[PDB]
Design a protein around this ligand. Sequence first.
Ligand SMILES: N[C@@H](Cc1cc(I)c(Oc2ccc(O)c(I)c2)c(I)c1)C(=O)O
Lengths: 199, 8, 242
Amino acid sequence: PVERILEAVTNICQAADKQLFTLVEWAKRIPHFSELPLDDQVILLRAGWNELLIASFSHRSIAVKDGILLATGLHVHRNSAHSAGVGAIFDRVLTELVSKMRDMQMDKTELGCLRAIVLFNPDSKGLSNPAEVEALREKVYASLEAYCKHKYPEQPGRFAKLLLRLPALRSIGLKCLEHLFFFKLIGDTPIDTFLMEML
Amino acid sequence: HKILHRLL
Amino acid sequence: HKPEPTDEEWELIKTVTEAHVATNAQGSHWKQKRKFLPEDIGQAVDLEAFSHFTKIITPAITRVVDFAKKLPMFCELPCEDQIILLKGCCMEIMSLRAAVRYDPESETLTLNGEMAVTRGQLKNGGLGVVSDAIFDLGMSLSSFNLDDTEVALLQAVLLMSSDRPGLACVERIEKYQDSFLLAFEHYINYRKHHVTHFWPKLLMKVTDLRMIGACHASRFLHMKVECPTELFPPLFLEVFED
Ligand SMILES: N[C@@H](Cc1cc(I)c(Oc2ccc(O)c(I)c2)c(I)c1)C(=O)O
């Protein structure tokens, strides 16, 4: 039932507080997520948001050639990236993701599930009950396989290929983490209040 | 581009 | 319904399988031909430990390349892409190969099918955290109990990664991967694994592997920061040097 999922300084600070809000509310609208212990929910979010965010705009940038569309509609051309020293990482997103997403015509349904899998990452350290989380993930790509079997029966390998973008998505996630800092430098437990409130 | 080539 | 592999696919299956088999060290008698690395070696970047891994890593690397050459499709690629594919999936496949050789009774991995090392040993050997990533994987693959074929297919798919940087015949490589994946998916249907969600679960491993090779790449940078350049074998360098 990925239908409930599909239905789901003063300048730069305006966003993020909105993106993060939209991400949290997106996760809350995800099956069984709001049922997990408070701590287990925040740990997941904080362990995935990187890839989740990147999975979002990567699919949104399918309608753009050699560019990325972000929250503020601020289209980003690869000319700025290479000029900012992030050309390499930028290109990966276009070829490994944006490209692959376009060439397969990945729909919002598939994107949503893929992002749902990501969230339910049972490997995340510290969470109280992993068995329960990996359960949820199973149930998640359980639906995904059936969707691909009915929605696109003329292509059996679709389901499979859908997952094989997560790897790319992962390693790219990592580069972004290494690139960006600041937030992390704010010591541990810098963000938990909000996550506790949105909860 | 080196030892790889000769191994090919 | 579960579509079993076709005749044109079984041909590719026996091809890849044979390709893996002839290139996996110690064949099927690895358990008896393995030697436990001295518990003293690598205590809590151990020069000694490292020197032993690197002293047996070059055959592994080559054996990987041999697996590639025993694949017609791969032989159809330009030398440019041919090199790139290897450089990328190299650490991944070796990792797979090592991880599928995990022994719960001993909690050790078998490098080159002859060298048993523990989590700690392989960690202090230069890999560091990667070691965990790998052992953990091996632990996970334990319940899968993959056979040569299913392992060969993974290696096959790992090789044909159409997202490696600098590739030319991208749509060409991607087509190959799609071929393997098709047969891969059908083969397990044939195997009729009784476990729930086997195919997906397995595919996630591809994520895990791609992340290992990556952390390994960052490890290599730190390795040449601590360890000397002379302690590195030529082939090894060429493989992970830009
Ligand atoms: N056992 C594999 C071959 C294999 C050989 C070795 I040495 C391994 O450890 C590494 C690898 C890279 C490094 O930089 C360091 I330091 C240690 C692994 I993991 C695998 C096979 O059977 O193909």
